[PDB]
Amino acid sequence: KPKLLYCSNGGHFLRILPDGTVDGTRDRSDQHIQFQLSAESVGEVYIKSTETGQYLAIDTDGLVYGSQTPNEECLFLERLEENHYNTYISKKHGWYLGIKKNGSVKGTHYGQKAILFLPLPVS
């Protein structure tokens, strides 16, 4: 069951374009906003594009990008927050996935609205 990942901050859906660029879009008719949250172990997920097969990754500097292989920085810890939203933290670096109000996506610290996502199963 594929999911949209909707960020409540600026109301953007997480998107990974086929060139590896990651951003947020408000357009839910976009073909690159569906993801499989493949589990590695309890509470750990990959964020994998259903359209392109790419894996979401965050580097040491907080740059968020799409990788064609699951590399050493593609694994996230998924946490249900008491506010009904989920957060996704980089297991390797400790950056939270966040989408800013302008739709840019980058590594974020806890406490910012950018880190809250609602996974929305498709169909």
Side-chain angles (χ1 to χ4, degrees):
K1 203 80 169 185
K3 297 176 187 315
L4 309 185
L5 287 167
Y6 175 80
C7 185
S8 53
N9 187 33
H12 297 92
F13 298 95
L14 182 71
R15 180 170 73 175
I16 309 178
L17 289 176
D19 65 350
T21 61
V22 177
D23 66 0
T25 180
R26 299 258 315 176
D27 178 26
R28 69 168 204 254
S29 79
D30 195 284
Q31 291 306 293
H32 310 89
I33 59 165
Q34 289 189 16
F35 299 94
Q36 305 160 27
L37 274 55
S38 308
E40 175 69 10
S41 73
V42 160
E44 299 185 331
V45 299
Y46 299 94
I47 297 173
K48 183 167 181 277
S49 169
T50 70
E51 177 70 16
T52 67
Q54 303 172 83
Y55 300 83
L56 192 72
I58 311 185
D59 77 10
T60 185
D61 303 313
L63 168 68
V64 180
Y65 64 101
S67 177
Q68 293 193 279
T69 49
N71 64 29
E72 72 275 2
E73 40 191 43
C74 290
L75 190 54
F76 296 84
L77 273 60
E78 177 178 54
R79 184 177 304 288
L80 174 55
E81 303 296 347
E82 293 308 307
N83 55 21
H84 206 124
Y85 291 107
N86 284 0
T87 57
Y88 298 91
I89 190 178
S90 160
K91 183 174 181 188
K92 176 81 158 189
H93 302 295
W95 293 115
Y96 280 92
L97 181 63
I99 314 187
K100 315 297 173 179
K101 297 177 164 68
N102 76 339
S104 63
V105 173
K106 56 200 314 166
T108 307
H109 296 155
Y110 183 79
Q112 302 177 42
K113 308 205 304 175
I115 70 169
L116 300 171
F117 291 88
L118 186 65
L120 295 156
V122 174
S123 304

